[PDB]
């Protein structure tokens, strides 16, 4: 139900039909520059018509940090419990609460090798990226997750 480009990107992460824009991978220096560039990309995606936009973090604890820092640049809804209603707009949400929800656009928060390197992490990263129906962006600080670096570079564009 996602785009061919998103399906091919995410399939390539598991090394161990509609069309859309290429997944975007974005390198950043630190959580503050990360949150700034996330905020800019959210503004771009809103203008292009995305109505449900998820910044997906690995854990609830990371969500709180992400939400606090993103709030410096834009307004974002923190998703922290199951009974929060699905609505249009921008949210910060952990993988385990995003499971089986579909968003127009997903921005993966800090897909670094520090945060995503175990096989458990691989399942979490895959789950996060497959929530995206129309646009996927993968942001990271420092060094990218091995599961991102492993994706053939023709399957994504860089910023």
Author numbering: 608 to 623, 631 to 773
Describing publication, verbatim:
Here, we present structural data for HelD from Mycobacterium smegmatis (Msm) in complex with the RNAP core and provide insights into its function. Next, we provide biochemical evidence showing that in addition to being able to hydrolyze ATP, HelD can also hydrolyze GTP. Finally, we demonstrate that HelD can both prevent binding of the RNAP core to non-specific DNA and actively remove RNAP from stalled elongation complexes.
Our long-term attempts to crystalize Bsu HelD, RNAP core, or their complex failed; our cryo-EM experiments with the Bsu RNAP core were not successful; also, our recent SAXS-based data for the Bsu HelD–RNAP complex were not fully conclusive. We also solved the X-ray crystal structure of Bsu HelD C-terminal domain (CTD), which was then used as a guide for building the model of Msm HelD. The first marked difference is the absence of ~30 aa from the N-terminal NCC-domain region in Msm HelD. The other difference is in the HelD-specific region where Bsu HelD completely lacks the PCh-loop. On the other hand, the organization of the 1A-1 and 1A-2 split followed by the complete 2A domain is maintained.
